[PDB]
C-alpha cells in the first residue's frame, strides 16, 4: 500500500576503506520519489549531509565532498557510499525519503542505522 524503507540495524566497515549503508525500498506504481536525504547524528541532533532533489545531489558538509555518493542506479536503491572511513564517521545515520502519492500529496519515511568502523 505505502512504501517501506529497508535499512539494517547496523553496518560495519573497514577503517580507511569503503562502506555501503543500505537504504532500499520496493518502488510502487503511482509513488514518485521527490526527495532523498541522509543525515548524521552529531550530538543529540541530526544534520543533513546529503540531499537529492529535482536539481540533483547536494553535499552539505565539506568533509564529505568527494567521499560521499548515492550511486546505485537500481530504482528504489538510495544507499549511501562513504569512501575512506574515519573513526569520526562512527555515528547513527538516517535515511529519509519523500514520495508523492497517487492521491497528489506527499508521504515521508525514515530509518536509522548505526555505522561501526572496524580495524
Amino acid at each position: 500500500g505505502r512504501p517501506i524503507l529497508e535499512v539494517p540495524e547496523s553496518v560495519t566497515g573497514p577503517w580507511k576503506g569503503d562502506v555501503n549503508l543500505p537504504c532500499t525500498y520496493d518502488p510502487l506504481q503511482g509513488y514518485t520519489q521527490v526527495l532523498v536525504k541522509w543525515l548524521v547524528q552529531r550530538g543529540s541532533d541530526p544534520v543533513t549531509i546529503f540531499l537529492r532533489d529535482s536539481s540533483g545531489d547536494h553535499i552539505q558538509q565539506a568533509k564529505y565532498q568527494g567521499r560521499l555518493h548515492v550511486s546505485h542506479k537500481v530504482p528504489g536503491d538510495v544507499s549511501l557510499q562513504l569512501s575512506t572511513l574515519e573513526m569520526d564517521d562512527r555515528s547513527h545515520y538516517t535515511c529519509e525519503v519523500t514520495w508523492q502519492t497517487p492521491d497528489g500529496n506527499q508521504v515521508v519515511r525514515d530509518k536509522i542505522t548505526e555505522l561501526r568502523v572496524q580495524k
Epitope: 540495524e9 525514515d110 536509522i112
Partner: nanobody, 125 residues
Framework: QVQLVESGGGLVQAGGSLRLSCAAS????????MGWFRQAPGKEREFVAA????????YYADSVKGRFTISRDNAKNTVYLQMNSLKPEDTAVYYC??????????????????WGQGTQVTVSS
C-alpha cells in the same frame, strides 16, 4: 536485538492517574523511536503515543492528546507513559514498542520491530 518489558499497569478509578514504564534490553536504546499502543476487548490495536530517539518530539493519538504524556530516560533504557485524567474507555492492554524510525511514521504499528507482551490497565466506573 531488543526485549521490552512493561510495568506499572493496574486497577485505577476514573479521574485518577497512572504511570506506565517500559524497560528495554541492550545498549542501543538511543537508536530507537519508542511507542505505546493499546488494545481493548474486541477491538483492534491502536496507537497511543510515540517519542523520538532523542526525546523532545512526541506524537499522540487524538484520543489521549493532552491527558497522556510520553517521556524517556535513555540512561535507564526506559520509556514512560504518564496517564492523567483517566476514563473508563482507556481500559485496554497497553503495549510498549520499539522501531528505528527517526521523525516519521510513528503512529503506525508497522514501523515498530519489537513489542512487549503488554500490561493491563483497567479504569473503573
Amino acid at each position: 536485538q531488543v526485549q521490552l518489558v512493561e510495568s506499572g499497569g493496574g486497577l485505577v478509578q476514573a479521574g485518577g492517574s497512572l504511570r506506565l514504564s517500559c524497560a528495554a534490553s541492550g545498549r542501543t536504546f538511543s537508536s530507537y523511536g519508542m511507542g505505546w499502543f493499546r488494545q481493548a476487548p474486541g477491538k483492534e490495536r491502536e496507537f497511543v503515543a510515540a517519542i523520538r530517539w532523542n526525546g523532545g518530539s512526541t506524537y499522540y493519538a487524538d484520543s489521549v492528546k493532552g491527558r497522556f504524556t510520553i517521556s524517556r530516560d535513555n540512561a535507564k533504557n526506559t520509556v514512560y507513559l504518564q496517564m492523567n485524567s483517566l476514563k473508563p474507555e482507556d481500559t485496554a492492554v497497553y503495549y510498549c514498542a520499539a522501531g528505528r524510525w527517526d521523525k516519521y511514521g510513528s503512529s503506525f504499528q508497522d514501523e515498530y520491530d519489537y513489542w512487549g507482551q503488554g500490561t493491563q490497565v483497567t479504569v473503573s466506573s
